[PDB]
Amino acid sequence: MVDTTKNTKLFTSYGVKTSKAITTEVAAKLISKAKRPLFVVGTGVLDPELLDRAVKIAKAKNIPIAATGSSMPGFVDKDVNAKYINLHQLGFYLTDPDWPGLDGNGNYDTIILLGHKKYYINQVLSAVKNFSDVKSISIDRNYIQNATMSFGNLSKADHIAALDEVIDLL
Amino acid sequence: LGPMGPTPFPTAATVRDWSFTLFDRYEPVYTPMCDQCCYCTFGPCNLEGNRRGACGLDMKGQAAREFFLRCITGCACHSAHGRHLLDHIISIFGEDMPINMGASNVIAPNIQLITGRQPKTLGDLKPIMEYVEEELGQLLATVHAGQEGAAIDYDNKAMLAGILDHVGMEVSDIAQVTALGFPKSDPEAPLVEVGMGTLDASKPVIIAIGHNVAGVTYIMDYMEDNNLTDKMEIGGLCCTAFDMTRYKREDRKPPYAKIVGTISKELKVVRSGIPDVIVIDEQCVRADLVEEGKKLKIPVIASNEKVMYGLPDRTNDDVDAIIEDIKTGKIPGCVMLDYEKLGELVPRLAMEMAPLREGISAIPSDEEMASLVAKCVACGECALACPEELDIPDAIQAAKEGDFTALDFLHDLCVGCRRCEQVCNKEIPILSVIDKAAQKAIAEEKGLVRAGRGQVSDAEIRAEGLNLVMGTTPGVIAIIGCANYPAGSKDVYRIAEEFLNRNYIVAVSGCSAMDIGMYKDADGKTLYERFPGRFERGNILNTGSCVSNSHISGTCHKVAAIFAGRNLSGNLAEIADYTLNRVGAVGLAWGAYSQKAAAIGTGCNMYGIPAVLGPHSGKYRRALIAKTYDENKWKVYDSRNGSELDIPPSPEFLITTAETWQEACVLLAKNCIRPSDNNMGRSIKLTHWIELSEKYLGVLPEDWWKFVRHEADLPLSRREELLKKLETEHGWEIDWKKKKIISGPKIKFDVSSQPTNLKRLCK
Amino acid sequence: FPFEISPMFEGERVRKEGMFVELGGPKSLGLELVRAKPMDEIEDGKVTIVGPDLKDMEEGKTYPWAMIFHVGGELVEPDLESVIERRVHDFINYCQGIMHLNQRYDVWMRISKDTAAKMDSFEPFGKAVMMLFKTELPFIEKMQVTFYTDQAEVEKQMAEAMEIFKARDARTKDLHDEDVDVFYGCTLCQSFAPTNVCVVSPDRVSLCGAINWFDGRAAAKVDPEGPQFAIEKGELLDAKTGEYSGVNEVAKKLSSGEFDKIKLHSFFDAPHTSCGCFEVVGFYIPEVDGIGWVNREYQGMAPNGLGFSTMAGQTGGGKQIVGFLGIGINYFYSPKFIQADGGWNRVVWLPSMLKEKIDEAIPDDMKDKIATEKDVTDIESLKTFLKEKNHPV
Ligand code: SF4
Numbered sequence A: 001m002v003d004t005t006k007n008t009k010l011f012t013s014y015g016v017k018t019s020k021a022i023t024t025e026v027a028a029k030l031i032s033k034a035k036r037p038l039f040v041v042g043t044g045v046l047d048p049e050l051l052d053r054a055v056k057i058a059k060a061k062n063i064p065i066a067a068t069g070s071s072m073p074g075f076v077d078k079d080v081n082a083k084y085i086n087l088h089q090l091g092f093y094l095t096d097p098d099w100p101g102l103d104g105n106g107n108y109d110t111i112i113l114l115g116h117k118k119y120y121i122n123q124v125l126s127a128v129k130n131f132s133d134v135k136s137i138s139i140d141r142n143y144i145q146n147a148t149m150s151f152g153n154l155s156k157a158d159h160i161a162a163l164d165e166v167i168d169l170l
Numbered sequence B: 001l002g003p004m005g006p007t008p009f010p011t012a013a014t015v016r017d018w019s020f021t022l023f024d025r026y027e028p029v030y031t032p033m034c035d036q037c038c039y040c041t042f043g044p045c046n047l048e049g050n051r052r053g054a055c056g057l058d059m060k061g062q063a064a065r066e067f068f069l070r071c072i073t074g075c076a077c078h079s080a081h082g083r084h085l086l087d088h089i090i091s092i093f094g095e096d097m098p099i100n101m102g103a104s105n106v107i108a109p110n111i112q113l114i115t116g117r118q119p120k121t122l123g124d125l126k127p128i129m130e131y132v133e134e135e136l137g138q139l140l141a142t143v144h145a146g147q148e149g150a151a152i153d154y155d156n157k158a159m160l161a162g163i164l165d166h167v168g169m170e171v172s173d174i175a176q177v178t179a180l181g182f183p184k185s186d187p188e189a190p191l192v193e194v195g196m197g198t199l200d201a202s203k204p205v206i207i208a209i210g211h212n213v214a215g216v217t218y219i220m221d222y223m224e225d226n227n228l229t230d231k232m233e234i235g236g237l238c239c240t241a242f243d244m245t246r247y248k249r250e251d252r253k254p255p256y257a258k259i260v261g262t263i264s265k266e267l268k269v270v271r272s273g274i275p276d277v278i279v280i281d282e283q284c285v286r287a288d289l290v291e292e293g294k295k296l297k298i299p300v301i302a303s304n305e306k307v308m309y310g311l312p313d314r315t316n317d318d319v320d321a322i323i324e325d326i327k328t329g330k331i332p333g334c335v336m337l338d339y340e341k342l343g344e345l346v347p348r349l350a351m352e353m354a355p356l357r358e359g360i361s362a363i364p365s366d367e368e369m370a371s372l373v374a375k376c377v378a379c380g381e382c383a384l385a386c387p388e389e390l391d392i393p394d395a396i397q398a399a400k401e402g403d404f405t406a407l408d409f410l411h412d413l414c415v416g417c418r419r420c421e422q423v424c425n426k427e428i429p430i431l432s433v434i435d436k437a438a439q440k441a442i443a444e445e446k447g448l449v450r451a452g453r454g455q456v457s458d459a460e461i462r463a464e465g466l467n468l469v470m471g472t473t474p475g476v477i478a479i480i481g482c483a484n485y486p487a488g489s490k491d492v493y494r495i496a497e498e499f500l501n502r503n504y505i506v507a508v509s510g511c512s513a514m515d516i517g518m519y520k521d522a523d524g525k526t527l528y529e530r531f532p533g534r535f536e537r538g539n540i541l542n543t544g545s546c547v548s549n550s551h552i553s554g555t556c557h558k559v560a561a562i563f564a565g566r567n568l569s570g571n572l573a574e575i576a577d578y579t580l581n582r583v584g585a586v587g588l589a590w591g592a593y594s595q596k597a598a599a600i601g602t603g604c605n606m607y608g609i610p611a612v613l614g615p616h617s618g619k620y621r622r623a624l625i626a627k628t629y630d631e632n633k634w635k636v637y638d639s640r641n642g643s644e645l646d647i648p649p650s651p652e653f654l655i656t657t658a659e660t661w662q663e664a665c666v667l668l669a670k671n672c673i674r675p676s677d678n679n680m681g682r683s684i685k686l687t688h689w690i691e692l693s694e695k696y697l698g699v700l701p702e703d704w705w706k707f708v709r710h711e712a713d714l715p716l717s718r719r720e721e722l723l724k725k726l727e728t729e730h731g732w733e734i735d736w737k738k739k740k741i742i743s744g745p746k747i748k749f750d751v752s753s754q755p756t757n758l759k760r761l762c763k
Numbered sequence C: 001f002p003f004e005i006s007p008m009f010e011g012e013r014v015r016k017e018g019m020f021v022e023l024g025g026p027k028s029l030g031l032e033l034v035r036a037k038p039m040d041e042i043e044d045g046k047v048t049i050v051g052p053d054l055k056d057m058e059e060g061k062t063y064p065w066a067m068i069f070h071v072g073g074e075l076v077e078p079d080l081e082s083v084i085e086r087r088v089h090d091f092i093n094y095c096q097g098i099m100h101l102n103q104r105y106d107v108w109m110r111i112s113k114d115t116a117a118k119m120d121s122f123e124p125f126g127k128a129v130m131m132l133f134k135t136e137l138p139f140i141e142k143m144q145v146t147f148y149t150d151q152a153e154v155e156k157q158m159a160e161a162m163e164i165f166k167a168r169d170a171r172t173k174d175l176h177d178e179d180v181d182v183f184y185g186c187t188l189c190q191s192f193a194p195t196n197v198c199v200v201s202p203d204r205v206s207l208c209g210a211i212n213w214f215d216g217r218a219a220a221k222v223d224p225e226g227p228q229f230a231i232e233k234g235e236l237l238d239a240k241t242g243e244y245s246g247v248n249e250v251a252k253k254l255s256s257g258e259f260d261k262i263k264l265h266s267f268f269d270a271p272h273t274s275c276g277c278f279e280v281v282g283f284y285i286p287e288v289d290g291i292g293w294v295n296r297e298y299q300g301m302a303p304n305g306l307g308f309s310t311m312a313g314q315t316g317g318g319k320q321i322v323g324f325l326g327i328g329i330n331y332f333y334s335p336k337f338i339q340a341d342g343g344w345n346r347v348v349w350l351p352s353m354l355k356e357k358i359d360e361a362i363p364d365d366m367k368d369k370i371a372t373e374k375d376v377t378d379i380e381s382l383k384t385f386l387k388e389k390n391h392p393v
């Protein structure tokens, strides 16, 4: 529940540097203190529970959503600002400080990751964290090493409880 | 000799201009696999944060070098395959056999485009292989410590390795098709049965794994000569199966060999116990085959110098002695490099081994499955070690109650790598458990796939040119690559069906063709029998193994030749520019894992053909993506007067990875748009792209108006409302009394305009 | 609309398993027709059904079917009726559960059960067809339909349909070059062949066999500034070789200097260019001074020893080469068929299937004179064959 740091096991490692295992309080503070955050959402949010949790999180702090993959149909009726973008493209665009963004107001400084695959988001973050200065917070089930801060390894119920506790502190 | 282009027999310096021109728009994006370099003993060096190692090479240079090494490895495995096959063919049939491919003015578009030569006999392919080797060697010399330092010349050398790979594939395919009696541009190739449920356990079963077909031809020659076709089953895994099913099949008669599956099936088949002997040649063969065959008493025979497998070399021994030794359990297999003796030993070994090993398999029984399922503790290691991220603990927990549906679902997604079993402290054969849970699906696993047709003839391309121009064929979709799929082997089938229903041209090859042919509709028909096998709209054609992928690319080259009269000889830059600016054709490797797929994708990119890869391909460490928001990136020259011309942002990538098959469908539909399309082609492409976007992403695309230059560039069914959307949301001025666009588009329509990326082709 | 409209439904086939009715068909009486009327003889957005409607039908039963469209506007003329009829087929296949086959009077219509349950009346289907026609051809600003369903009414319209079809055929056959003011230019293939310009006249059909003089007329009417346009002939520079000044300056303007002259009905004197899409290719035989024709569908060799692909690979790309010519099949039925070289009096070879297909074109006396591959397998054989039968060459 509250504990999202007791499991940071990995199968293979990218190198010495790894993301910090944070708690729900730290994650909520980091999300609520960002100057210009972007909610990068994969198709794993199509799970109904994760869907409404992500919608509530985006509504709470007015965070634009980048629905990578085929997760756009889960945001058509919800009153949020979600736009489609390829994750490999988005990761390429993030490293360019001259990219106007999804609304033309400039680049972002902090991204939030929820509902991806640990072998694809890690590959994108490999470029993002090495050729840019954008910080990443992973609120997903898996421990993402290539992020800046991430949750630990949690089960489905544990992940739902952690997301709830974040939403209450948002 | 005829007119020769500016670039015959290219080197690293000779193709640098075209590669840099391409990289100006489609910039390389590096996604490193590590933060360390482990090449020389100065290291391993940490390069995190784009830091440089002890040799001065930075992280970007290391990622580029790793991708370049992958590309040259793939190019070296088609070239070695091609050389070995060509040498065997010349030794058997002689080196003066005329090349027999079909009915086309240009026989070898890749060879003529790169080297400038016009081969006519099997002995004229020998020099091309010498060049393909020589340059290859130079390329490998760049992997050394202290060689190229910049990360852009590594990309240029990668593109050179890609085009060399395509040349080698073309050479190999031409040699084998000419010699071994493959179908010659046949739009009615025979249908062959595929699936694990096709092999019959009653008869002895031989399983051939690899890519080369030199020894398998001898095996099937012996089987036919001695009349054992009906008394023995022969099956193939990977592309060697396609090579058998094309062998002596220009008579359009159904064959007796059967395709078992892709690489992901290999271990599963071994765990089934159906094979009675496994003969391996070379590429794509699991390294733990003897380690299981010794448990299940399955002999392993190697037939290549590349893959000997640490086995005794009995090339000079008698076949009866080897059979006795294998029968008595002295050795689990042997290296038999003599093709004549191998072709007799393998069927005889199967015949003498089948009765002594019938009924032995690794599949657990009901009580054994119950015990194994009850043994688990749900520690989560198997899910961590699974490459496909499969919920194994949840499936096992559901199976504890008696709900074996979760493992049945997991069977399709699993690639049969057994990596989970090595991290289970309870020692549970998870792969065997999943196979037993999906026994029924495995039993009912059958399908039909059309045999390799060879290369596309000139007449079919000429017939389809009018369809492409008159806006009846939206574009060309190639579905190639490996079988490292993220969500099972059905995504390729779904994409192919979706694009075939919309009258695209679908060309398949490799393991993707096998996995497309494994699924049927309600009427019990596969796509191959649902759609014709010609090169036209609404047709799906199979070229064969990966060495036939060149034909796909080669077809594009002929589009530049037979339609615009362009010279092919040594003119890579011109033909590539034509293909990039005019031909709407996209490739798709949904499960690419091997270096061959990387080399094929890079070679396709250097020819101007964009490709979409599976999510796992993000581990290749390089993509080619354009900056759509940068309006200065999309500017070309006008060949009529040398003026500056504007083009719509399409294609927006050369290599990129999709995440789901719906996003892949949307991307493939979008990136078939070209600046040279007329009104009808643009209209049909926009219609299909917008419909697919609405179907799968649920919204209308945000940049569609970038491709609307004319009122006749809009879908017929949704023209007026799209005009209203253009007027209200953007301020375009529309003639509502004539349904015409008065003003607003940035790019005017001029069908006579000739966009080009090369300054030297203007005026 | 109750059903979706999209070209992706073109390949759908309504099998009898899901078929609800089979209108017209290959057994009963079926018809399609487009008529041109003045502006005061047409009421827009009108669908009239005579006899049973879709409600008064039986699942599995076949009923007589006759669609008659009254189209009208300002630029609409009777000669442009057939062009409209040609699209009917396509615009029926855009609908979801509707299947259309053949044309004229051999038509075949089928509706699926799923779409029958959605579109209760024949009215929305007709409205969708009309909107597709109006969007495709803007110059048609008034359209209405009549759907005849009884056998009596279908038989009543059948005679008028046959009479007007005969009249249309007579008209299109009688039209020639001197009885037209404009020659219609097409550059659609310039997407793939940057220097290819096509000129279409009543006596010179398009090399792809898809655009007639009337097709080009309608296309130029829709978009005068598009890839299809109208050019005035101007001075008659050569009647024998179909050379006009207008075509000359149009080629000079739109060919980027690749060629400054197009000579219609000529082979060795500034021949018409062709991109890649010939239904037929003509080649020279200089030993017999003859002309051979090979279609795209031929799978055999020629007396020259060359197939279709090898020969067609030496003509095209927009380059005005001499020695080969890409033509459509309907060019054989033209009285000005290569009239600058002798017409049929120079043809010495055709494949058997091509000869059977275009036998109507060859004159009766020369029908035996022309040699096929059923008798000639060489070039010496062709020489002896032309020697025995006394070919005009
Ligand atoms: S090649 Fe360069 S970066 Fe790699 S280990 Fe050697 S010195 Fe370090």
Ligand code: SF4
Pocket: B376, B377, B378, B379, B380, B381, B382, B383, B392, B393, B396, B423, B424, B425, B426, B427, B428, B430
């Ligand atoms: S590794 Fe073995 S014990 Fe652990 S969860 Fe997986 S199957 Fe169960």
Ligand code: SF4
Pocket: B385, B386, B387, B388, B390, B392, B413, B414, B415, B416, B417, B418, B419, B420, B421, B430, B431
């Ligand atoms: S064998 Fe199958 S379930 Fe086990 S790790 Fe490999 S892919 Fe995953």
Ligand code: SF4
Pocket: B469, C186, C187, C188, C189, C190, C197, C198, C206, C207, C208, C209, C210, C211, C275, C277
């Ligand atoms: S061949 Fe036909 S479609 Fe092509 S330009 Fe000529 S008339 Fe137009």
Ligand code: NI
Pocket: B465, B466, B469, C189, C208, C275, C276, C277
């Ligand atoms: Ni053409």
Ligand code: NI
Pocket: B465, C189, C274, C275, C276, C277, C278
């Ligand atoms: Ni053409």
